[PDB]
């Protein structure tokens, strides 16, 4: 999978199940273009969001709906979404994991990437 | 000071200084605004951003330039820069700190929110 | 896998390579004892440590040698290793994973636990 | 002030109150000597725990009763408690900020080292 994105819950020790993730890429006219979007399943990945042929060079944002998951356990969270951008296949095509670890008033995020 | 930003980098343990910082607000029309930038100084806060009197509640964007900062090291950087995205409420006084800690395929961010 | 530990570089943008992990169990006299150990392996992860059957409730410490990993790539780093303590199976056999994300001068560490 | 620490809660969004820390020396013979202890003030800091005499190189700890802050939450935490080893290094005045993020199955720590 070129785009894999994974999920995980600080407060309960769970990977983050239901979450919603909108992926734009950033067209010639510099708007944000709807490329993919899912659910986060059951281990807290979302699968499948595109192929090798059409994940082309550019530059990508996954937002994740961080306020829906936390708002569904009852908790007022703090931020809208979590948002990253990135630059991606610019020196060939790569695999790429985005991870994020969330609290209500927090978030990390890391990339792994590889070269398959 | 109603909104205050700190900025931490987890390569070399020191403050992030001459980061920019921009600060938007959601206007009426779902676009954003500028509304206050800066670059970090040597403790790497930036401070004086606004007043109480223009912080009114509403959806604001913290967007760091980690992207540059990299670059000026000498390293390869992932993220195109961090964007924080939140809404400010009024239920009671609230000061915000917004505070990031960096590294090149990673960052986290937190909220403190206090009263005076 | 009743305990497996992954471990990701934020510097790099890797699975952390080569990592020795070793695991300790309280005994009754209130001393740590050896109870697993083993390196990770190219995926970040280290499979194999123990069985359901040996995996008893108690308190369990996983140390990370993060010193050395950092050395290896340059890097004098600031932490002598990352520990993570925990009381395990306390109601009923259990599934943990052990994630930890590293940089030079700071890490994370979250754990993800799942009922069999 | 050679050594503070700094102690954030992920989950309200506000300084750790009140948590218990103590910090311990390793001595000439492979023990940890007490060195200094508190309880964080209201934001959420510890100060004046050595002075820059006493404060000689050497391997550090610093342990934070994190699962007593929880449970006075009433909220089920994962860690026993989260402990920070480092070597404190003559090379350069050097003071350290040793600060700490906390949510309930996930801490994140980083050192600020900068130089008066
Ligand atoms: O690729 C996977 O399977 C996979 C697994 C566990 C993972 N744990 C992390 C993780 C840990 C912390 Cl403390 C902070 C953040 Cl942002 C991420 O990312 C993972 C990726
Ligand atoms: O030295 C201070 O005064 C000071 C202030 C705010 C700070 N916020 C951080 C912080 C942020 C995140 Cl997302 C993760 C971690 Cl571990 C730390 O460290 C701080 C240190």
């Given at each position: 999978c070129p785009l894999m994105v994974k999920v995980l819950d600080a407060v309960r020790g769970s990977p983050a199940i239901n979450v919603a993730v909108h992926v734009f890429?950033?067209?010639?006219?510099?708007?944000?273009?709807?490329?993919?979007?899912?659910?986060?399943?059951?281990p807290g990945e979302l699968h499948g969001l595109t192929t090798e042929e059409e994940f082309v060079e550019g530059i990508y944002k996954v937002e994740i709906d961080t306020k829906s998951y936390w708002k569904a356990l009852g908790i007022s969270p703090f931020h809208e979404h979590a948002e990253?951008?990135?630059?991606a296949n610019d020196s060939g095509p790569r695999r790429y994991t985005i991870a994020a670890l969330l609290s209500?008033?927090?978030?990390?995020?890391?990339?792994?990437?590889?070269?398959?």
């Open positions: 890429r950033k067209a010639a006219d510099d708007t944000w273009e709807p490329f993919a979007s899912g659910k986060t399943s059951e990253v951008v990135f630059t209500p008033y927090s978030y990390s995020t890391t990339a792994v990437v590889t070269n398959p």
